[PDB]
Design a protein around this nucleic acid. Structure first.
Ligand SMILES: [Mg+2]
Ligand SMILES: [Mg+2]
Ligand SMILES: [Mg+2]
Ligand SMILES: [Mg+2]
Ligand SMILES: [Mg+2]
Ligand SMILES: [Mg+2]
Ligand SMILES: [Mg+2]
Ligand SMILES: [Mg+2]
Ligand SMILES: [Mg+2]
Ligand SMILES: [Mg+2]
Ligand SMILES: [Mg+2]
Lengths: 129, 149, 186, 82, 151
RNA sequence: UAAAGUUGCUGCAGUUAAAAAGCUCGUAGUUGGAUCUCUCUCGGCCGAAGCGUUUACUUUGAAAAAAUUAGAGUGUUCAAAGCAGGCCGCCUGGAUACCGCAGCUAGGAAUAAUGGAAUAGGACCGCGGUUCUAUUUUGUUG
């Protein structure tokens, strides 16, 4: 059965971007998905998206700009401390000039640079570059 | 897909977006409640009550009109089945297959289907035990299966 | 007529109560508003130099209000000149349960008394003459949102001019930007 | 393909799609107002009715169950509600 | 409830029960005074222990035991011995090579006082460390909390 | 030991190179869909008290042998070392970090479990009752 809706959303947007499409629809949606899409927003990788309210679970129509190389999930959602963040970004990111690791800390959902700024660790969700 | 069959079908009801009662529906919540009560006295499960109300009396969702689901309505006033209707129907099916089997001993498809039905019955019974609908000592027995139904 | 929860009626509440009494004196629907009992009222600037009236109808009496809402609204529009009037039920948002709290709640917070549910019901009552056919939340590049509401066309005109009044009301009592449009068909 | 607006589906292809596969799922059924040949008074009937709907004000059978949409009795007229 | 079921006479050692009493003060029985102590760490004394009549020298409230050291919690799994039960403690053990946990458990035999009645298989017990009470018992049940779906 | 991504957690393979059980059911195990934005009392506005369901997680603080490792200073003639040394009696070291896991500690509340009313075996206000009981009574005694 379907588990970890975030993985399905990220796979759908990744496959749509590999195919060159300008919009992708993701279903089901979630608050975790929306926060991940917003952190992807603030760095210019995705573009504007819109939530459709079906009374069961919303859908998301995501506009796509060709700037997205990869976006994926890391399951299981392992706990990451400040010390191990360097190892995680060395493993996942393609460079130190660009790319982001997304994590849930008690401060919210954000990229690894903001987590370094706020001096908080958490649980890894995924990555995009 | 199906729990006990290879098939993976997509066939179900699609409730509409609007949760408001239609204007043409002149029935009140109390009228729907009394209709439900007398239908239960006639000896129908909540499923049949919903089908009859939808087909003849023009109500789409009883929960939509009365703000409450059918089984909760029946249990609230008192006349509700001792064990849940889906479990009852599963037990009835198992009893029927067993009755067919005891005379047709050579049937091997019936034995397999019976085992599948018993597995479904056990899963449902354990779920209902965890939700305290059934007493913890409640167990499925082939000898008393016909007695239960 | 007004029965505030805080039992501190004000000038505009008194005006609304006396207006409702005058309706109970010279409008065949008197027998309805003699039983009914509003709780609060407010006047808020909406568009440029325009204003709108919000009446905080009690929740258990909401449907009885909605029975004759159209007549009440038209009569108050006549009495108040160009002053749009909207009836919104008064709903309590219990605080979200937090690990740093106390005995304020010995029972779990009901889902009806929640911020999201309260806001949805507020919008539904705000557009009562129409029906919410659809809802679409758009998230902009700056992180801001926009709730675009698809209303029935059956009853367009009735609230077609009332556009930007619901938006101002919602921006006031909710703080969220909302736009209204009518789909071509369903 | 490529640049196809999923936000603004066209009504014809939205009806073309499966009921559960639309932007928002909308059932394909409806409620009908059925008038008997002789009885003056109408009855509310489900389009995909699974029960033999009897005239509440007579003995006439209004519709017969089928695989999909219920079959109205010959002569019994009907109008779509809403 | 008769409390004399052993070969020896059961009695709280601190209480003196043979104080001379004149016939003018012989209104039935003297209502034998009960010895009980308040164990610290913010644990309330059960009313049963105060108003009871059981004799239990291992009782944290009416016996000769001191609560000290570790305070733990468990789920009651078996109650087939006299005045002592078997509880289960579950935890996750981390494995660093895989960065992953594994579910582990260990049983513990803990003394249960007669002051805790209506203890069922499944409730939570807060136990506290004490001196060795038997070969395998080193804890005493200090608090009982019912299961999530009790009547 | 690395090379060995030829033990694969990172990170391997199973159509034909070695490889998916003949098929289904099924206990344990593993995984599991949306959804919910601190106060009343005590002591000098604070210090106190609970308890917010409990955590996991994350950050901090404390406690944690020396040697070894990392590392600061220091021309052993250089270096591996050592913990010495420097100035014309004085001057100055003998640092710091790290130390899984479990156990203590205090912030955060996203994520993930868990509960809170549906025989009302409900919350809050006042009521009334039932019972037992500690002391007020009160220069004193009594
Ligand atoms: Mg299966
Ligand atoms: Mg090797
Ligand atoms: Mg290598
Ligand atoms: Mg190989
Ligand atoms: Mg081969
Ligand atoms: Mg095979
Ligand atoms: Mg299993
Ligand atoms: Mg989930
Ligand atoms: Mg050391
Ligand atoms: Mg060294
Ligand atoms: Mg530690």
């Amino acid at each position: 059965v379907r588990m970890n809706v975030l993985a399905d959303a990220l796979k759908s947007i990744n496959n749509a971007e590999k195919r060159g499409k300008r919009q992708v629809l993701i279903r089901p949606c979630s608050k975790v998905i929306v926060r991940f899409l917003t952190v992807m927003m603030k760095h210019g990788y995705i573009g504007e998206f819109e939530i459709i309210d079906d009374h069961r679970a919303g859908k998301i129509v995501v506009n796509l700009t060709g700037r997205l190389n990869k976006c994926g999930v890391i399951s299981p959602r392992f706990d990451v401390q400040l010390k191990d963040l360097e190892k995680w970004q060395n493993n996942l990111l393609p460079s130190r000039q660009f790319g982001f690791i997304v994590l849930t800390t008690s401060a919210g959902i954000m990229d690894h640079e903001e987590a370094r700024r706020k001096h908080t660790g958490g649980k890894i969700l995924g990555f995009f570059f | 897909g199906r729990m006990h069959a290879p098939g993976k079908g997509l066939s179900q009801s699609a409730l509409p977006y609007r949760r408001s009662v239609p204007t043409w529906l002149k029935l009140t919540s109390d009228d729907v409640k009394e209709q439900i009560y007398k239908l239960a006295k006639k000896g129908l499960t909540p499923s049949q009550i919903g089908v009859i109300l939808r087909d003849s009396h023009g109500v789409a969702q009883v929960r939509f009109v009365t703000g409450n689901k059918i089984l909760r309505i029946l249990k609230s006033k008192g006349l509700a089945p001792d064990l849940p209707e889906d479990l009852y129907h599963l037990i009835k099916k198992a009893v029927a297959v067993r009755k067919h089997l005891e005379r047709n001993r050579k049937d091997k498809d019936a034995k397999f289907r019976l085992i599948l039905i018993e597995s479904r019955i056990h899963r449902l019974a354990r779920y209902y035990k965890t939700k305290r609908v059934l007493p913890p000592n409640w167990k499925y027995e082939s000898s008393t299966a016909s007695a239960l139904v | 007529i007004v029965k505030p929860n805080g039992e501190k009626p004000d000038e505009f509440e008194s005006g609304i109560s006396q207006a409702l009494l005058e309706l109970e004196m010279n409008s065949d629907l008197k027998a309805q508003l003699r039983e009914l009992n509003i709780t609060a009222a407010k006047e808020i600037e909406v568009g440029g130099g325009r204003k709108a009236i919000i009446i905080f109808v009690p929740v258990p009496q909401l449907k009885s209000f909605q029975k004759i809402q159209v007549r009440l609204v038209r009569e108050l529009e006549k009495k108040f000149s160009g002053k749009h009037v909207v009836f919104i039920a008064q709903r309590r948002i219990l605080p979200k349960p937090t690990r740093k709290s106390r005995t304020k709640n010995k029972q779990k917070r009901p889902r009806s008394r929640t911020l999201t549910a309260v806001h949805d019901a507020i919008l539904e009552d705000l557009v009562f003459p129409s029906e919410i056919v659809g809802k679409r939340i758009r998230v902009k590049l700056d992180g801001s949102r926009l709730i675009k509401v698809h209303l029935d066309k059956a009853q367009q005109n009735n609230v077609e001019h009332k556009v930007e009044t619901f938006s101002g009301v919602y921006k006031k009592l909710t703080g969220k930007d909302v736009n209204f449009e009518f789909p071509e068909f369903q | 393909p490529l640049a196809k607006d999923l936000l603004h589906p066209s009504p014809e292809e939205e009806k073309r799609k499966h009921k559960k596969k639309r932007l928002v799922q909308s059932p394909n059924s409806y409620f009908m107002d059925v008038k008997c040949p002789g009885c003056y008074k109408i009855t509310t009937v489900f389009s995909h009715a699974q029960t033999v709907v009897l005239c509440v004000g007579c003995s006439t059978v209004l519709c017969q169950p089928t695989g999909g949409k219920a079959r109205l009795t010959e002569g019994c007229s009907f109008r779509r509600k809403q | 409830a008769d409390i004399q079921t052993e070969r020896a006479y059961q009695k709280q050692p601190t209480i003196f029960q043979n104080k001379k009493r004149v016939l003018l003060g012989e209104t039935g029985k003297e209502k034998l005074p009960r010895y009980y102590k308040n164990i610290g760490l913010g644990f309330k004394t059960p009313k049963e222990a105060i108003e009871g009549t059981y004799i239990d020298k291992k009782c944290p409230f009416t016996g000769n035991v001191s609560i000290r050291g570790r305070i733990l919690s468990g789920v009651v799994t078996k109650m087939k011995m006299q005045r002592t039960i078997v509880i289960r403690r579950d935890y996750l053990h981390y494995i660093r090579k895989y960065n992953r946990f594994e579910k582990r458990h260990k049983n513990m035999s803990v003394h249960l006082s007669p002051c805790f009645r209506d203890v069922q298989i499944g409730d939570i017990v807060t136990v506290g460390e004490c001196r060795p009470l038997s070969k395998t018992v080193r804890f005493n049940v200090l608090k009982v909390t019912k299961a999530a779906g009790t009547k």
